[PDB]
Amino acid sequence: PKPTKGPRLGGSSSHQSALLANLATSLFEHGRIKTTEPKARALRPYAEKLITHAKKGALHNRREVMKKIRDKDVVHTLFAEIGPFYADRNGGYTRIIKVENRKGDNAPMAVIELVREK
Amino acid sequence: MNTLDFVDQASLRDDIPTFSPGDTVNVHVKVIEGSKERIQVFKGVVIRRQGGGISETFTVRKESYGVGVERTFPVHSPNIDHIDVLTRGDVRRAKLYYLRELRGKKAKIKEKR
Amino acid sequence: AVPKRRMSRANTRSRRAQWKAEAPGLVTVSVAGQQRKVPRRLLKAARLGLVDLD
Amino acid sequence: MIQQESRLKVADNTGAKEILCIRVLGGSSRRYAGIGDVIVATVKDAIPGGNVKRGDVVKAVVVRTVKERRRADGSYIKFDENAAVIIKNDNDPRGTRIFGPVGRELREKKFMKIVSLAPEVL
Amino acid sequence: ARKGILGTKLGMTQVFDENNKVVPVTVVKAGPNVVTRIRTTERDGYSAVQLAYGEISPRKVIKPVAGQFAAAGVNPRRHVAELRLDDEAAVAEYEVGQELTAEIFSDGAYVDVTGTSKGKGFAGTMKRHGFRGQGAAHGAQAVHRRPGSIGGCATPGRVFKGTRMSGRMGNDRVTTQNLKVHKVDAENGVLLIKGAIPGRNGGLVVVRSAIKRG
RNA sequence: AUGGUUUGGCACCUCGAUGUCGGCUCGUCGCAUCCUGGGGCUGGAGCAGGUCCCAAGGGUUGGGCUGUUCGCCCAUUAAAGCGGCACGCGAGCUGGGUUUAGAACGUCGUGAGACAGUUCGGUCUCUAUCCGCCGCGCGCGUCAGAAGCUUGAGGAAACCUGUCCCUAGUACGAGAGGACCGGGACGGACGAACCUCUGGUAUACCAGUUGUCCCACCAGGGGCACGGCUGGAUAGCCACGUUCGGACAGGAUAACCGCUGAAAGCAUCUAAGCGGGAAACCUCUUCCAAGACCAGGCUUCUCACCCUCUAGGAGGGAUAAGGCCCCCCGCAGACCACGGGAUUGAUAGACCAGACCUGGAAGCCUAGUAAUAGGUGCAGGGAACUGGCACUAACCGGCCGAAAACUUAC
Fold this sequence. Notes:
Chain D: GO terms for molecular function: large ribosomal subunit rRNA binding; structural constituent of ribosome. This is part of a larger assembly, with chains A, B, C, D and E. Chain A is α+β, with helices and mostly antiparallel strands. Chain A has 4 helices and 3 strands. The longest helix of chain A is centred in the middle third of the chain and has 19 residues. Chain B is mainly beta. Helices cover about 5% and strands about 45% of the residues of chain B. Chain B is built from 1 helix and 7 strands. In chain B, strand 1 and strand 2 form a beta hairpin.
């Protein structure tokens, strides 16, 4: 999606890519994760586009997802439940909730979770 | 929807033959030589095409008298009376800038068969 | 560069007065029945029970 | 775009092979010379039997450039090499034969003899 | 006298004239303008006409602006601006409620476009003032872009108000003069102005008749 | 006779420290003016000069040699001005020279050593307190609280110039040569705005490919090796790109040209007067600007409800118009601010479609012993741009915020 306007998240572009991949993997595996607010803000489009790939479930899309997720159990869950679950929803798969700041460095924490309403 | 499209379409020019980089075309360009009209044909290889709609431009490169010549034309330019596509080239790139360093035998292009 | 002179009390206090903290704005919320103050930034989180409230 | 200390191949048959630009005539502190500009140049390489000699200060006009040059009708022209033709004070070539194509800009600058002698004008 | 209109910068495109030359033209949405207030010498001390432009929902206007528009007699508009005329005979042809559109201009007319320049942020002297930086080699130590000398040797011992140094750049009202109107698209209310006008796409611009070439 | 721009003289100034020349970067001022501008006489026929007045608005090039200032030279140019400001500018830069310690040559001294004689090499430290300057906010004020649009005292920016074509090969001139004035086009340097074109960049784009490890394996991919290296690369920023600018006009003037005429019966551009007269001056162009304390003007909106001490004023509370904070954001941005949206919503993301970039995806089939090639197929993949779409987030929300009175005139 849209690249970050400012400097990268983890201090380098490769670290940022690995960070986004790991965060997306954790979000798909658990269903909700807690992280600093900018991290979730950057994670939203990445996870939503991965879910969009998972929605139209074909071998091509499976390879497209696997070239970013790298975790096979999470890929199987994504293409078995998460994919079909959002079949009739057009966008807005995730939501961001702002929570209390961190104690060590006063970083703004936020919780990003998949929607389960319908 | 490309907001300036309604302005663009009025000056857009039809009848442009379809072509791709690598094709060999001859461009019939009208010129002015002491206030009289004549058409000078420029025959060469289409090495690039930068899509912009009305501002779409294509480049044709020819080897003339041992000196390489490149000419860039707007596709919808009224100064171009007619474009004729002679042969279809087989290329793997959208821009043939590597042809600027090749001469003669090495600078030939495969023909689409 | 080094300071050429010792700063007087007036200038020191006047510039020191600008180092201060602003009071965050609090709005009420109803969780588990009892009413308590929570910043409006955390209103939704408090309503979903994501904020530890002592 | 040709400037000071730039080298140009010679596109005529005066015996010179390569010249070095000294000044770009046509205004004080002028910077670049495109197709059709007159420059002051010194001959760096010359044919052993040619009439010109190395180090001769001459007057030449640029006829080819590598940097593409915009035209009035929105089209561009780009050559492969920078080339110049040695001329006299009356804007005629000191040679009798021109090698390689030239630009249309030599017509609006009243270089009729060079245009006529050129093998082709683009 | 000097005509004018409020418009919006839509973008820039390319057109070919009747000599087949290329003409880079900026598209200006010179939309419908409504006269809201008339400035007169007998009341305000100067002669000017006030124009309104843009569309906004009626629930977005505050009570004072809505009251002013209602007193004028027209629906509120997003943008309001004044055109300074020269005398009362110049303002005699404008009355409140009259609608101004793009066809007040004609092909080949010369116009002056006023807009807010793009923002460049806190810009250094190399960018803000065209300073030539110091050498990038030959031992120069951390002075590749700094301005260098400021004053000199005591005497005034001060810095001479108006010294050019780094600071905020852009975001200032700018007027470009003697722009030629290539075409007036009446049905879209669109002006094709040859050249570049200040501001970003979608910004507010004021198109006025040229003061030098008109 | 001026000047302290040159070498001088004095030593009042600092040895419990004032960087010593050139160069770079950045200036500001004077006119004793290099060009452009206005005139006079010409030992000025015209051209072109000579010379002298007025004139400081702008401009006043790039290189070779030398550490150089200076200077000579090479190309140009309208011209390549002279000077002041610690011979401006090292808490801005350089260390080439000078000016430590090493070493050598010539000369001097028996010797240690020495030479405003020569040559090679030789640490340039600092987090900005105050004034100053460039930008940005907070607070209060402008006699109720606010909101739109502005007038402008005052200030800043800009001010350059060339060639060619008609008038005209005329005037003048033995001929050669050679115009005044007025119109038009194209340029050089500089400045601003902008990204349609060209070009640069491109750390979440597309494709190729090397070494290696991993996804059990083939296939297909992934991590690392400067984004591993290459070929392209939309948006944004930008110039090498595009467009535009220096004006026109008026007033008062300088040198000067004058009209009308005294003192001084004539004369006299003058002591009364009245006129022309320049890139200088005031307007004119662009921009800032009511903290302009004379704190402005035209409008519009709310235009009210309590409690307390003692009723003199004051204090406190709650409000209206409106603003801010929290939230979604920006091509606005260090922070702040500014601008837009906030369910009565297209502000951002996602989704769908298009534009554009890349260049023909995976799987399957076919041909080939294989490398590989063809079909399915303008395929697949994808960021900025455009249009739809409330699916996600802009929230069942907090803080501020409206009137002593009197005099005179009508």
